[PDB]
Amino acid sequence: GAFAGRRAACGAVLLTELLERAAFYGITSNLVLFLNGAPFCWEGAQASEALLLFMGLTYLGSPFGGWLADARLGRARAILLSLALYLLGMLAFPLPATFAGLVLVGLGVATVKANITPFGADQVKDRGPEATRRFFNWFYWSINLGAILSLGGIAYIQQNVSFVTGYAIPTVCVGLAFVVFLCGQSVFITKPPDGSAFTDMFKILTYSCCSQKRFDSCKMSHGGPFTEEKVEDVKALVKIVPVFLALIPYWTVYFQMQTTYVLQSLHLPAAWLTMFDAVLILLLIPLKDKLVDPILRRHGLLPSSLKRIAVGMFFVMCSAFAAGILESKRLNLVKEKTINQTIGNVVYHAADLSLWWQVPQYLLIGISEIFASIAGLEFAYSAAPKSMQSAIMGLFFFFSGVGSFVGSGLLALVSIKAIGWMSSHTDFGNINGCYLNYYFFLLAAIQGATLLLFLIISVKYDHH
Structure with missing residues (x-):
């Protein structure tokens, strides 16, 4: 019903x-x-x-x-x-x-x-x-x-x-x-x-900011014309902001993995590779929706959105570790023989290995998505005040874009001459003489640190 x-x-x-x-x-x-x-x-x-x-x-x-x-x-x-x-x-x-x-x-x-x-x-x-x-x-x-x-x-x-x-x-x-x-x-x-009247809410927010310039906020607003609803909305937004601040590195790692997995699969229509992930999602969303959710309902194990985001981060770290191991194995194998292939109108040298070895890591990423992004959206709707849910969603999308930009900057920064992890990256292909495994390991370490920070922040938020 x-x-x-x-x-x-x-x-x-x-x-x-x-x-x-x-x-x-x-x-x-x-x-x-x-x-x-x-x-x-x-x-x-x-x-x-x-x-x-x-x-x-x-x-x-x-x-x-x-x-x-x-x-x-x-x-x-x-x-x-x-x-x-x-x-x-x-x-x-x-x-x-x-x-x-x-x-x-x-x-x-x-x-x-x-x-x-x-x-x-x-x-x-x-x-x-x-x-x-x-x-x-x-x-x-x-x-x-x-x-x-x-x-x-x-x-x-x-x-x-x-x-x-x-x-x-x-x-x-x-x-x-x-x-x-x-x-x-x-x-x-x-x-x-x-x-x-929601428009007035916006100016009320500015007034609250002015009240900041002129639990201090609650006691200050108690005397003035600051009826509890707007003050509680301001407090909720203040609590929400650190969650997005901690989630920005998660989006950075997510976009970097999205790019690097395709780049690596190129060495094993070019958009079809990305479709792989979506295909896995199309296979995972219904089954979970019919099986994973009810079982928790039976056991009363229903977690908060933050816990599911943490589980997604853990799965992301596991996928990064698996990708690093696979890249190391591919580098070890490729030092003996190479195969010339053509995709679209571009020639690439790929190792003598099957493409299905990408199935595990991708699968893990899929699980992470079905455990993280959707949950985040739920949080983005749950903690947001009823007046400005759209503004919260827009800020969330902006923070995701900022994370993507930070990821692109980090990808540029891990290509300095002193780093030496890649020198043919400027060229279209020939990633054979590169060190993408180290990049995957660094991504996994950053993901673990971000997971720990997000766990601490989530515990602190849930305590209040």
Whole structure:
């Protein structure tokens, strides 16, 4: 009965999210390749910088998207405006203009990502937190399904017809999402926030900050016009911030592992490797949702989101250790024979080893994801105040982007001449004379330290 009733609205929201994710992954799958192979052939550095700027704008727009959704507008209306801007920007690709289109697409996706999760989360808030947890599980499953569908269909229909349609496919998807969402609204009534006074909440926050400049906060605000709700929201946000601060290195390690696993698998369509992870997720989310959760319900072992994030961090560390061991074995084997292969239009030298040895580590990462990210989202919805859930989601996405940037900086920094772990990394391939195993071991050590710090912070937070 918990999932009955608004099932149609939940399915519509999941379909819209799937279409949005498919369009985004279609955009990001071969943007650099399309720009390089286009008649306006730029340099590799120029395309890389454009992609990095696009990703940074998408990461940065999420807090402002949540701010715009929370203030002077609703949630569904802000989603509609964001996806309209997304469609308008995406229409430019099949046709300075490129910069404007990238800006529009980035703003649209940043607002959509920041606003879709809180809306669907509050849509099922009628029942207990278990309904929200199941909704988040199916939300992540739909995201992965959309990723797989895009990364397959792009190549599936790219060969049949002209390549322009390859970029026209996401746009149509966006349009479809638009229509679906519109229809959903006609029967949504998913407890619309109707946020009008929430704008004042923002200025109240500033007033509280002024009260800081002019448990000190509680006693100071008791005398003034600072009714307990806003003070408790400020306290909750203050408690939340260190969690994200500790989670930033986790996102750094996550993105670095995502890049390095593909880079290593290249030496055993290039996007299919990434699909592997998603495929594993598509296999793991349902089974767990039907088996892992009930058993705890039988034993009363239901942990907090922080404990599940810690378990995910432990699985990440185990996967990093396994990847390091596999890289060491591959380096030991490769010092005797090499095999020349071609992927796309690039020649790579790979060791005489099967590709299935990547199955264990990937599997571990999958478990970590199904134990961590979703749980974090639940926390991102649970501890956040009811007034500014979208702002909290936007800040979380911004912190994830900052972690990704820190990971890229660390990857650049572990390539200095004094380090000596890699010298052919500047070249496209020939990672045979490199030391990626040491990089994996360093990532595992950093993950362990971050896990310990997060455990301490989680214990301190749960004590209060």
